[PDB]
Symmetry: T
Subunit: 64 residues, 12 copies
């Protein structure tokens, strides 16, 4: 059985790096992280000093 | 990093109050609840005494 | 077996009341109305005296 | 010909009132506003004192 | 309030049995599992000895 | 001209058998049933003794 | 209250004429037909002598 | 950079002519109109003397 | 078994004729073309002398 | 690089067996078939002696 | 009230840089640009010397 | 007439480079490659030494 958690990563550099940010967090806390699916991308502009790229991913991990 | 939990709130009054019901529950258990996105709405009719409005939300919270 | 009918309710007050308007009509004519799923919402503005909220629902009823 | 503008209204009270907030703004600036279609709903939680309901609408107006 | 978890069940027999595999896991760990909604189906072919059917479900459970 | 009715079939055995349950009902009441399209699948768990698979279909029939 | 019926019209000439074919049928049988929304288009090729254009519409009519 | 405007064209003749009606309007007011994408089609029936076909398009134009 | 190919037909006349253009091409090269499903429509404007209607279809053909 | 082909399998028994029918065909003709994603399911009723279940899959295979 | 404009940015380098190109244009002409949502990505290949990445964004700005 | 092939490119560097990987393959084998549309993005994590970014594209090429 796989389970997915819905995470939004952020980066001041790129959408790829924002996806990595989410996956990094998942790997900090979860065992057996196997894949991620991108479900949304966006950019935070008018509440931050530097534009912040965001990539939202379903991160899948194998249970047990 | 943000994480989302997929919650269905209920209310005998309105779709807005049903969204609040879910958000209330998220705030009981989670720190740093930041926003919610409505993903579905519905009404339970033939198993309840009063119609029950339901609003399903992705509730986003900031990790750490 | 459940069957759904696709109804648009209207209200001069709210999207919740517009959903109720559709469900009310379904219950006038159908037995065993069990639930409704919201599939669209809108507002009629420039053909009415008062703005009219509309909520379109699939209203499910149990056959037999 | 109709044209649509994509507006997000806000309210501290309800999703209906948030839709009205967008439509109100459209009517301030545009002639011949005819209808609105709801395309998203959400709630701002962790940057505001009171939860703020948001309803995003395509607001249609007749050209000429 | 209902909460949903996004689980992918697997089976070497059928899509139905794969849905059951996910639901079985949810019932092992959660109280008050009430329904599941199928959100994706697929088949693993070229990393397994036998084709493996997969059914991804949102499994809903009642909180409290 | 074809018309479609939106039916949810149920089965304690499989998603295929649940689709058949809906189609069976359509054929009881309608002439010239020609095809069905699956539009949703789900499982009822916590209100039934045995898990109940559900398959929702648009069932198309030829008018006249 | 509006209700919609899901009809597929056909024509050997065009997608517009196929939409009209469905609407024509709705007007034969229903009072107060108000609008139609196109939801699918297709072409039947290898079971007919002439290609047959099909347009599927939700046809809305006002109840009462 | 391209920008899109969301326009609904109308015609008493066809969906193609309705798309042209929107594009015609865009070309009256905008420079560098490059393409259009159809996003919806419909038919106005019970407020007009003749059925009116509607085609909604995103009309893209090049900025600068 | 059916297979589909994803083709975009073009026409200076209509969306119907653009669908036919794709189907014509499929029939030139494939045996047992059975149906087509429209998946997108658009108009090329600012790289052509005459507006060019486009209809993208999945064209289904029976294998063997 | 992976490539996908869009195949509809058929079976007089089940949606699972219909998916297998498509995958079987892909494996007859292609090397390195790795997975399939279900994209549609349906049932042929009024042109066949026995109901025929259909499962449409994107079948992915590794190039080279 | 927020309003969104639908812009396609381009870059010969990356999808991130293409999103920035659109946002840059929005900030040239609009006050109070707050966020962007990615709605499509693509690549222009056979009309340009170098591949051109494109990212289409809804760019949101606060009115007043 | 344009035809599209559905390709998934991979890269250990970025989603942009993964799109290029698919397009590169298309250009190796096909004449008149004109554009690509991104339809999915993902990351392979727990079967590879380095995370592998994937971008799935419909790659369009002009026939004849
Ligand atoms: C992808 C994305 C979507 C957003 N959507 C909204 C929104 O719908 N409403 C909102 O108030 N702020 C939204 N924001 C945040 C906004 O830019 C700003 O930080 C808030 O307005 C602060 O209250 C969004 C930010 C991002 C990156
Ligand atoms: C939005 C919504 C969707 C529902 N969908 C289903 C369904 O697909 N099948 C079902 O058995 N009950 C469904 N129900 C519950 C139904 O109204 C009733 O309580 C059940 O039939 C009890 O078994 C739904 C209820 C709501 C509020
Ligand atoms: C949600 C909604 C969508 C509508 N869409 C359309 C449309 O696409 N075309 C149209 O002519 N009128 C539309 N109308 C009706 C419009 O406001 C007006 O009453 C008509 O233009 C009368 O011919 C719509 C009304 C609502 C509430
Ligand atoms: C519907 C909605 C969606 C939002 N989405 C995002 C988002 O994707 N990323 C984000 O940083 N903030 C988002 N926000 C704003 C968030 O709540 C907070 O104000 C920001 O994090 C401030 O930077 C959203 C707010 C709303 C109401
Ligand atoms: C429904 C489904 C979707 C899949 N999608 C992908 C994918 O997008 N990329 C991938 O590398 N592997 C995918 N795989 C796994 C693939 O079959 C194989 O196990 C991997 O390529 C191993 O690295 C998928 C498997 C299934 C069952
Ligand atoms: C596919 C499916 C979806 C359902 N969705 C809901 C729902 O959204 N809300 C709800 O109260 N019950 C729902 N139910 C019914 C639920 O399992 C239980 O019978 C009800 O909670 C009884 O009130 C659903 C059942 C099925 C099979
Ligand atoms: C838009 C459209 C979709 C169709 N889809 C299917 C299908 O999924 N399976 C099928 O057997 N026939 C389908 N047909 C019918 C097909 O062309 C042929 O008449 C049947 O194969 C006869 O059994 C479709 C026809 C049209 C016009
Ligand atoms: C595509 C389309 C969609 C429409 N949707 C609606 C609607 O949702 N509600 C409505 O009141 N009128 C709608 N109308 C207008 C309707 O036919 C009639 O003109 C209005 O009811 C006048 O108030 C629509 C018209 C078209 C062409
Ligand atoms: C339906 C449709 C969609 C198009 N989308 C794009 C696009 O996203 N980007 C683009 O550069 N050109 C696009 N074009 C082509 C555009 O009109 C023009 O020919 C190109 O800009 C040439 O580089 C599109 C054309 C059509 C018909
Ligand atoms: C999933 C599915 C979808 C279909 N859709 C259509 C359709 O849209 N139009 C049609 O004429 N036949 C359709 N058919 C075929 C239909 O049942 C019958 O064989 C044809 O009407 C023969 O011309 C479909 C069959 C299946 C299995
Ligand atoms: C994302 C994207 C989508 C496009 N879609 C189309 C299309 O549907 N039809 C078309 O003629 N050109 C399209 N083009 C443009 C195409 O590559 C080429 O420039 C045109 O064919 C010039 O007429 C597209 C370009 C891009 C980047
Ligand atoms: C975007 C993406 C989606 C995937 N989906 C699945 C899946 O649904 N099931 C699966 O078994 N593996 C999937 N995989 C592959 C998975 O990470 C691992 O390689 C396989 O589990 C090997 O059997 C996917 C990989 C990617 C990159
Ligand atoms: Cl989710
Ligand atoms: Cl329907
Ligand atoms: Cl495809
Ligand atoms: Cl838009
Ligand atoms: Mg930096
Ligand atoms: Mg988002
Ligand atoms: Mg009360
Ligand atoms: Mg739901
Ligand atoms: Mg009042
Ligand atoms: Mg509507
Ligand atoms: Mg207040
Ligand atoms: Mg939104
Ligand atoms: Mg076995
Ligand atoms: Mg999946
Ligand atoms: Mg049994
Ligand atoms: Mg359902
Ligand atoms: Mg003729
Ligand atoms: Mg169809
Ligand atoms: Mg005329
Ligand atoms: Mg519309
Ligand atoms: Mg001509
Ligand atoms: Mg397209
Ligand atoms: Mg048999
Ligand atoms: Mg299909
Ligand atoms: Mg360069
Ligand atoms: Mg695009
Ligand atoms: Mg490297
Ligand atoms: Mg994918
Ligand atoms: Na989730
Ligand atoms: Na219906
Ligand atoms: Na817009
Ligand atoms: Na394809």
């Amino acid at each position: 059985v796989f389970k997915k958690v819905l995470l939004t990563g952020t980066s001041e550099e790129s959408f790829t790096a924002a996806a990595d940010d989410a996956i990094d967090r998942a790997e900090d806390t979860l065992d057996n992280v196997v894949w991620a699916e991108v479900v949304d991308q966006g950019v935070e502009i008018g509440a931050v000093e530097e534009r912040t790229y965001q990539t939202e991913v379903q991160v899948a991990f194998e249970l047990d």
